Amino acid sequence: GVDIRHNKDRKVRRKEPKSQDIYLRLLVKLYRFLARRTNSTFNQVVLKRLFMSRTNRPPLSLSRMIRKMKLPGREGKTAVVVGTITDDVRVQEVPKLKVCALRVSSRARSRILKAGGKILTFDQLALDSPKGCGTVLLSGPRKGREVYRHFGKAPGTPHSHTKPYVRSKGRKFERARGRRASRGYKN
Amino acid sequence: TNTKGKRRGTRYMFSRPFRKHGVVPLATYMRIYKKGDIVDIKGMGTVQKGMPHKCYHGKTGRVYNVTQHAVGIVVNKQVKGKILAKRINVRIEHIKHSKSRDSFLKRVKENDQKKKEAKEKGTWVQLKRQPAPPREAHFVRTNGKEPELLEPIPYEFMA
Amino acid sequence: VNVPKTRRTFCKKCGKHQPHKVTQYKKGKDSLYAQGKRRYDRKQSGYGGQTKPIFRKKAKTTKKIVLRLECVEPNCRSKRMLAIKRCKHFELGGDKKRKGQVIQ
Amino acid sequence: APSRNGMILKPHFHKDWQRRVATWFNQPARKIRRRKARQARARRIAPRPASGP
Amino acid sequence: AKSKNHTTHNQSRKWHRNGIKKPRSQRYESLKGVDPKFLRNMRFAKKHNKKGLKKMQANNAKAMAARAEAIKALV
RNA sequence: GCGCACCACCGGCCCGUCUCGCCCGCCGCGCCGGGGAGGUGGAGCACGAGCGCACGUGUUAGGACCCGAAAGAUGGUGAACU
RNA sequence: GGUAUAGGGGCGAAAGACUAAUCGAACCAUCUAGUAGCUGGUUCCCUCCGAAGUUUCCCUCAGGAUAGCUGGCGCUCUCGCACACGCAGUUUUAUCCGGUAAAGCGAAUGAUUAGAGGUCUUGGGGCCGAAACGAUCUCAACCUAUUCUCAAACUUUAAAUGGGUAAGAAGCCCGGCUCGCUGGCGUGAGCCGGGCGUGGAAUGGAGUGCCUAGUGGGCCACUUUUGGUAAGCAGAACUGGCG
RNA sequence: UGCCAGGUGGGGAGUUUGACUGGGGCGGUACACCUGUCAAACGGUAACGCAGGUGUCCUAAGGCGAGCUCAGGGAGGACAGAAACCUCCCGUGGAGCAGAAGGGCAAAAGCUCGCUUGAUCUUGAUUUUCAGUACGAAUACAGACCGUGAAAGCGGGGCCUCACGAUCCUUCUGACCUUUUGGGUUUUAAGCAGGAGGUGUCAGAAAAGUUACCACAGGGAUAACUGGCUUGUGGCGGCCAAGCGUUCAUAGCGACGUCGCUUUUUGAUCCUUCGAUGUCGGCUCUUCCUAUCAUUGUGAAGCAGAAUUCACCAAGCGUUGGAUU
RNA sequence: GUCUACGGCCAUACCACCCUGAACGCGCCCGAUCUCGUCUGAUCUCGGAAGCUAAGCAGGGUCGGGCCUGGUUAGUACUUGGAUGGGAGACCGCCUGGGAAUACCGGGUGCUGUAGGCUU
Ligand SMILES: [Zn+2]
């Protein structure tokens, strides 16, 4: 006879990756041991990000990684990205880097190796710095997907700039009553 | 069903009190308001332009915009699912300064004074307010005169 | 309602306040060659009877009178429609009523 | 009935499309037949180019 | 076949099931709803804030030097 | 202290539109073209995240979870009863 | 017995009668698995969470859409890893809001009883009078001090309950810049640099983004209350239950 | 005769014949809006609840600046009287502000004057039903042209709360506006922006009846039976006592008031039943109730006998034959 | 002690009657040429300083009316929450907290800001 609301007693956070691939599970075991032994929170963050789904770890662009490493203070530090590193074609000068990532695109890998940089996997990063010392943790833009453009306040509402679900943009598919001031109203 | 009129049910709210009709006093006109000032809204029947809605009567909000002779104020209104902070434009006569924040500001100044003081002395002074404590047990002196006996009054039909 | 035939008001082309001649607005002919009229005729032609709905549920008994104001100053002559609230009695220059007189 | 921000679409399945559904289970057989016909024509025109004029 | 017209019996319980909250207060609120002349003046001031940056930097350096001298005198 | 991702805000940029205004170019000097500042509208830019396949749920068009009408149309057969 | 009239047709001394046990539109096949907001049914186990009959719109009222109630997927952070920010059907401290209960009508408006002083003022019946405010009362509306009873659409007053706020770092104290706004100097706002931390009680880990089934017939009970004589009647407000 | 055009054309064909509703129909609009109450002192809140109002009107009844105070009452002055005109005083608004009501207003927001059309044009922001979407209405601003006053200032309609309308189509206005398709010119047409023509079932179908010849999918959400709560009404019984009763309230009655009982009448509700509970009477038959017509036993009188009504225990036994319907 | 000009709170300031005002000041008051507007210099405007506290105004008084603030009314009316409390009901009582308003009886009858005067 106790009044406790069991509505949110079960936490929905992930515990193991849903992927059935074996290399990711081996990395999960390694970082589980590292997080439960070492006092560093870097291992815990890396394990949590490894648990995340594909959409929750967007790819990181080479230009974004370059601009994040160019910040003063993180000189000679290894970049740790749980997603994938993708080449950026609109950048010419690429300094040498120390990048740790699950995957790297072929073009980005060629660019980094030609620039004189070094690319490491997560097991190599664990062997080098078990507690993640001298590491810069980076991630891609979470809201970069076009899916989030359709989220938020619904269209046809004042002060809303949400992209509606339209079969094909055009003159006679929208921008009519509800959007034109000359036809009914607008928001 | 009831009508959705703006001034429906405001027979007594938007009405001046007894022996206080006539010309509006000029202190309300000649008192200033700044941004972020806590102000309680009270409608006035004499002035109709810029009159706030009946739902905002008695509600208190902060000032965010000040026009020539009106004030933009954000107030919290609860409508059946949630509380929304919404901004309304209210003329000067329908607005008053709130002393609730002034009472807290005075206590803040007292705390600053009492922290500047008693610091070089080293004696830490109690700054936090405390609820009503026990009544600090004391002695009651019955000097000579004994306590007065109270006999219940017998019933009698008066009316 | 009563309105004067002259009204000094804002002019879009001139940009300043100038006098305007005031007239009441009336509907013109359909000219028989509008796109909607042509579509209506081509749809009504042939068999099938009446295609478009016919409004037979009139309720109100007045129209919003529209004032056409023509700029008096030459070289502009800019017309502009001005709307007024509903009224079932409209006139221009109609007997300004001579406030302070007798009634017989 | 629309439900919480779905795309407005108009499927063109109001006719008797099931009677006029055209399957493609004969695609590999058709490819084999075309290949055989092409080889037969090439063997017919022995010194002439396979592609043609 | 008359039905019930209107009631709000369970509405309070429905509201409080999710725990209705006050609106999210965030610092640096939006400037929507401010008079256009004031907005223009603030925009001009922000645009011209870059003017006289060296004077502000020199004044800050002088203030830092004064504070350093004061703390050296204190110690 | 450098400050990922993300939120709030301030600025900046692109296109449509309004207002005030001053100058630029020429193969054709004109009912030419270009540029500024200040508001506003856009599903926009602001160092990217999409494409293909598979699975799950929800919404529809189709027979459409299964069975159910009173009706309508097309073409044929009945005066062996009446 | 033969023959002629075949289905929106035939035929009918007329009953909507007959037309192969069917006739207010015969029978067979096809469109056709026609449509149904309406009935009925909807197949194994365990575990966890777990509702609504409410908002507004619809020729809407046995139904949908939209919010609400609900589930799932997560994500961003704090930490019993001797070292905590924020949030609340709570209370307390100060500040405002109300016009209901109550009370009043010797105070405004409306109703209303009865006596005293009033040719206040006029008028009707009357009696003493040709009449007379000359004496006598009376009934009519009014007054001067009183008196009896009232008001959901009255109120000078006026609670209990209740509704917004503030109880600090997103705050104070200085120094300097910008302003095409405002001004005599000044404002006011925005920019940068520096100094000061437990800001009433008690309990809670919080915030955020999407996919989203079902529900949109309710009923009962303490208290308040509308119509009705009353109703296991109809219709409302808070809370709690059945559902 | 062949083809167009106009008229006639339930002979024939297709279809429609709103919604709420203490069943439906009839009656009304509670269908779009506004005022006070309902409404329980934030707000919001139902009924075919109560009292009402609206689909107008205004070139002034809008906007300024100035001057006066209104309704009413008293005292006075030739015609002149209760009401014509003039003067003095009192006069918190008891007048007026267009309407229905509420709020509000006194060197006004009222009346009279003088000038005027801020009832003009254009971006946005916000408020009321809100889903926090439109429409309508409204509030602070801003950018131009203005009106008025000496000026501060006020005014982009009416002192505030109501007076109104989506898509499509048509019509008018505006740009030295765009396209009109291979290029060029001109009519025409299609475009952008701002008004109007209207959907009163007022978030907006184009819409007459009957069926007793009827049909189908459903509903006891919804009626006509019974039975359920209540007893207004019907029937029956008490309490007080002004009087009727020749005298005398209570032998028998009983006004003005008031308290109850019954479901053997009609009412109200729709709780059970619309995949069916056979819908009035009469005949036959059994049982039960007393609110007792008569019989048994008694109390009472305006009970001399007879006759008689009033009351008590009391349902054991009886409560008939016919004309009409 | 007090007056004028501009005010703030708007009756403790208002209303009725009586008494007193030394000086400045506020006004009454004298005229219509000029400015100004009316049927009338009545109001307003203008040009003045022969008379006055007569009046306004200021101060005081009324066992004054009213107004403001207290006691009484009264822990009464009412009211949050509670009970397997009473009663046939209408209603009432108790526990737990808050707490009114008339009649009736006391006190008071404007404070104050800026600038400029008089009693030097
Ligand atoms: Zn012009």
UniProtKB/Swiss-Prot annotation, chain B:
Positions of the UniProt region annotated as Disordered:
111-144
Instruction: Look up the domain of life of the source.
Output: Eukaryota
SUPFAM superfamilies annotated for this entry?
Translation proteins SH3-like domain
Question: Which range is the signal sequence, renumbered to this chain?
Answer: none
Question: Is Disulfide bond set as a keyword in this record?
Answer: no
One annotated Gene Ontology cellular component of this protein = ribosome
Please give the InterPro entries that the UniProt record associates with this protein.
Ribosomal_eL21, Ribosomal_eL21_CS, Ribosomal_eL21_sf, Translation_prot_SH3-like_sf
Q: Where is the composition biased (Basic and acidic residues)?
A: 111-122, 135-144
The entry's localization annotation reads: Cytoplasm, Cytosol; Cytoplasm; Endoplasmic reticulum
Q: Write the record's keywords in alphabetical order, separated by commas.
A: Cytoplasm, Endoplasmic reticulum, Ribonucleoprotein, Ribosomal protein
Which family does the record assign? Belongs to the eukaryotic ribosomal protein eL21 family.
Q: Subunit info?
A: Component of the large ribosomal subunit.
> By what name is this protein known?
Large ribosomal subunit protein eL21
- Gene of this entry: RPL21
Swiss-Prot record, chain E:
Which protein family is it in? Belongs to the eukaryotic ribosomal protein eL29 family.
Phosphoserine modifications at: 30
How is the subunit organization of this protein annotated in UniProt? Component of the large ribosomal subunit.
Q: Tell me, what does this protein do in biology?
A: Component of the large ribosomal subunit. The ribosome is a large ribonucleoprotein complex responsible for the synthesis of proteins in the cell.
Tell me where in or outside the cell this protein is found.
Cytoplasm
Q: Which organism is it from?
A: Oryctolagus cuniculus (Rabbit)
Residue positions, PTM N6-acetyllysine: 32
N6-methyllysine-modified residues are 4
Q: Quick one: which gene encodes this?
A: RPL29
- The UniProt annotation puts the region (Disordered) at 1-32
Which residue stretches does the UniProt record annotate as biased composition, category Basic residues?
1-25
- The name this protein carries in UniProt is Large ribosomal subunit protein eL29
